[PDB]
Design a protein around this ligand. Sequence first.
Ligand code: K
Ligand code: K
Ligand code: K
Ligand code: K
Ligand code: MG
Ligand code: MG
Ligand code: MG
Ligand code: MG
Ligand code: MG
Ligand code: MG
Ligand code: MG
Ligand code: MG
Ligand code: MG
Ligand code: MG
Ligand code: MG
Ligand code: ZN
Lengths: 284, 154, 110, 150
Amino acid sequence: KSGTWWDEHLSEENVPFIKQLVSDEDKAQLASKLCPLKDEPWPIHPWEPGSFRVGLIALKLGMMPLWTKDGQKHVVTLLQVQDCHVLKYTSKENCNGKMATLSVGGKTVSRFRKATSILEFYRELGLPPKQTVKIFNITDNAAIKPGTPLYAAHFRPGQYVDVTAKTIGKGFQGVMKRWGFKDIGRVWPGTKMPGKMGNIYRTEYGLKVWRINTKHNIIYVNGSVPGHKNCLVKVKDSKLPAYKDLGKNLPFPTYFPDGDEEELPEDLYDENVCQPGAPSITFA
Amino acid sequence: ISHGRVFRRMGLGPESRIHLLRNLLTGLVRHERIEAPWARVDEMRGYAEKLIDYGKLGDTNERAMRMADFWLTEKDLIPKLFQVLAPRYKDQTGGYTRMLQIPNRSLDRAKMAVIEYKGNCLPPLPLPRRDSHLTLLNQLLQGLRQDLRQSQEA
Amino acid sequence: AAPKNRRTIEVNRCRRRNPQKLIKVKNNIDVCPECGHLKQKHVLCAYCYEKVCKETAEIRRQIGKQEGGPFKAPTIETVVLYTGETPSEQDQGKRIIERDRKRPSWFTQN
Amino acid sequence: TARGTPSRFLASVLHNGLGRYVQQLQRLSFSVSRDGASSRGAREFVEREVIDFARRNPGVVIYVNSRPCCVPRVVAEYLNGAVREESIHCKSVEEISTLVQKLADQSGLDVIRIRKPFHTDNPSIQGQWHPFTNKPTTFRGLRPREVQDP
RNA sequence: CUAUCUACUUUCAAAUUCCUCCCUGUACGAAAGGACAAGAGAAAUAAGGCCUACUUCACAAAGCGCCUUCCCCUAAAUGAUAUCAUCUCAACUUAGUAUUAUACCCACACCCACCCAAGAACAGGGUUUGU
RNA sequence: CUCUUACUUUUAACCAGUGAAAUUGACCUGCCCGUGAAGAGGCGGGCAUAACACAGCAAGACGAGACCCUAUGGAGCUUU
RNA sequence: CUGAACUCCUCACACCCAAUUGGACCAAUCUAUCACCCUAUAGAAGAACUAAUGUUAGUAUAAGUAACAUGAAAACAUUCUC
RNA sequence: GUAAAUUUAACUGUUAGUCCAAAGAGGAACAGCUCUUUGGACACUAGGAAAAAACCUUGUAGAGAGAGUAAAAAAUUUAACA
Ligand SMILES: [K+]
Ligand SMILES: [K+]
Ligand SMILES: [K+]
Ligand SMILES: [K+]
Ligand SMILES: [Mg+2]
Ligand SMILES: [Mg+2]
Ligand SMILES: [Mg+2]
Ligand SMILES: [Mg+2]
Ligand SMILES: [Mg+2]
Ligand SMILES: [Mg+2]
Ligand SMILES: [Mg+2]
Ligand SMILES: [Mg+2]
Ligand SMILES: [Mg+2]
Ligand SMILES: [Mg+2]
Ligand SMILES: [Mg+2]
Ligand SMILES: [Zn+2]
């Protein structure tokens, strides 16, 4: 009748043992999904105009200055992909939408703080539970087998991405900070008044990928993204019309490092990015 | 908005806050176990831990003596810090103090805590104790651990 | 602004008796193994804590007599010795506090 | 109320009148003062009217109790257990005669709102209407837009 | 306003504008004159966010700083009443906007305790360091 | 002030103790248009609508909140 | 065809106009005489209250709201901060 | 055709006019405006006209789970042969 938590009744001897046991299985569960292309992968189709591939969940590490060969400075946000896997596939008919949906999971989290139903879902999939789960609308040719790991090299330098996350929560704020403000007998619905500010989902559209770090799975994206550092963000191909149909040269349906290709360099750069070890630039 | 605001607002302001903590820290050093409002004990616990670190520098150290002089209002405690408390924890790298919540005090129902310097002479506090290893759940987990040893050995 | 109308008892009961206003049942209460009294899981037992404080107060009163004045904190460790006990080799060169009582079972000599 | 009071349906006691008519009034109890202006009418009623009423209604037992009282009353009891007390205080003989005969003809059921001015246990002779009463049947009971030989 | 009542406290994100260059001395223009979109850069404003640096500051908040900002708003042809003609409150055909959008959101134990970039309370996130 | 930002204290909000007042026809207290209506929560037409705390807001309800003439009335004060 | 408190129908019939007037009745109270579980005939009068910007008392609403209060530890000795 | 009228003896209260139709006299051949006259309605009911003092129907005294009625629903789309 009373409440309980995982180690409430464990002894001093069994708390370290159980902590190890559940940590070793997680490491072995993530290492068993590192070769998706030899585990009966789903059909890999070529990219076609009008295709929509999946995105990924990344953690916001922070911001860094970046310089271009034209001598301009650019501030970028480092987005690191941590334990990102495909979790579920839904076809067009069952999804109640025009496009099929691919569910993707983010950072690995403790199994001791998750609902039983969620714990049962991950048990079947064979993956540690995730912190955030997002839905991406895909075409039928972009379907990826649930359990496939997603990496930062899924995006390439020169590409644009929309980034969605919850904004920094400012709590109950006044009109001046919330709205920047210092007679029909009623207030209209939607009137700007004091209330809870921030802590809502926002999207930053058309942020170019300056650089990719394959070793640490970090995406260097232009400008800033909503939310605090170490928050989980949803990264997706830019929906802006100018950036339509530029996925012809991007990994489709996704990037499989297991696949037969020359291993990518530690860092992938955009043509205009000044690399750290390059000579000092001159404008002549 | 108080994002990343580590310190609490107490007393009549910044200077009053330090003096309130200093008085609590002075009482802890003399008595080695005091009881006060939970938030104030929690706020003072960090200073209690760091004070022991300055005591480990030694009385000869000028900066350490200046710290003890300010934080210890009763000067007879300063010798106790360098010569009693600091040597007591010479082996430990931290965790000098233990803080436990005690029942709300009668008058204002304030959340209360007891904080002490580990290793004092006073009678031991009724510390919370984890369940016995011999319990049914722990015995099932002990058997599981033993089997994982045999499997690992093989 | 003054109230436009008197609030009816019907309306006031809905406000006063709303679940949000009702005292929540506590599920963290438990029985203390040592004394058998009730305690909350995250809080020290009130009965057991008072027992420790009572003995601690007597010891502190004994410490006061030995010091015999303010600003006389000793520069050596202190050891409490109950009737029928003698200083240990480890507990040598330390201030000795003598309690006219048998050592409590919960208080274990170290 | 109508909303503030009770109601019932038109009814009889033991289907009275179906086989034979039974007078539901069975007992009348009169309290009359020997002295008392308010009992003058009741005293006169007992002298010249009660005996003739008693003979007319042999089924009713009439108890006349002469005792000191300020308010003379007649208590009427019916076969269904109903008890109806009325006051004859300062009423003339004619008024008392009217009230007593009125009690004799009542059934003893509660004098409250009667929902319907009619009651029948057999409302229909030809079958109560239902949604299929006036609907024709179709060959093989096929439904709208249903296909035979599926 | 010591605010009882009504109303309201996220219509979440399609953006406007001015200048310079370019198109181009091109289409048109007797000629002079001189496009329009298509784009390029630079500004500002508005909306939304953010802290790498600068600045007020310093576990953080902020602007004076930085980043992002997307679809579209009535003719043509043929041809009758009236055997020419006629864009048609004639019919057929084509074009045409409104409509529809896309994006975002989406799983549910313990909810005792602690922590929190979450927060008035409540709620929410983390605890696989419940020293 | 452009153009506001940060922090401290107080207030604030939450817990505990104590515990006022103005106000209050009743209330099961919605929106749009119409109705003299920019006089409608209560009327007409239409629309909307499971129930119920807490924190805000101040558009409305609701309240805190001079001047006029009139009465076969005064009082100062001014005198022609 | 629907559609009134108009009209008819069964029954009833003095029972919807302010002030005002006229004619009856009447709560309670007291008095005379009755009565005697609460009445009668009369005589009398401080004789009837949803309509008050009225008085007094009780209790609500606003509202458990506004507001109010005790520097710290301790052995309660004392010391410390201001 | 109707049933009221005058007089006598006593006595009380109401009376600061709104709208509709009609005829005038003033304003502006404005006002839900100024004045007079004729009639109607409104402080007596109900039905109808969207809600509805003033328009229409109807008068008004009860009960009915009967019936006949009264007033009572706005229309309209705008040429030509050579
Ligand atoms: K024509
Ligand atoms: K600032
Ligand atoms: K209105
Ligand atoms: K208001
Ligand atoms: Mg926040
Ligand atoms: Mg304070
Ligand atoms: Mg801004
Ligand atoms: Mg600015
Ligand atoms: Mg200002
Ligand atoms: Mg309180
Ligand atoms: Mg009639
Ligand atoms: Mg009187
Ligand atoms: Mg209030
Ligand atoms: Mg207050
Ligand atoms: Mg104060
Ligand atoms: Zn105990």
